[PDB]
């Protein structure tokens, strides 16, 4: 290529960057917690093993 | 009175043993195991909220 070396090299480091960005929009967002605690503690009754 | 003590101290090693005679009888009774925790072990939050 003629401003670059390997594709493999040069996009992953894109995606490296890329995903920082990502995280950044993610922890300042309002995304809802989603999870299978299932009846934890407080009878947690094996965690619903179900 | 005779032989007996002042009858405070003398009831209490009578039960003082007997405790011991009780454990030795639960721990073989076969007995059920009996709990309001509702398989709510693997928690650490609460036995149940209500």
Chains 1, 2 share one sequence.
Do not use: C, H, W
């Not at 920082?20 to 995304?31: F, M």
């Amino acid at each position: 290529n003629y401003g670059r070396g390997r594709e493999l090299m040069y996009q992953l480091e894109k995606k490296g960057k890329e995903i920082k960005r990502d995280l950044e929009k993610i922890l300042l967002s309002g995304q809802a917690r989603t999870d299978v605690l299932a009846d934890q503690y407080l009878t947690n009754s094996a965690a619903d093993p179900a």
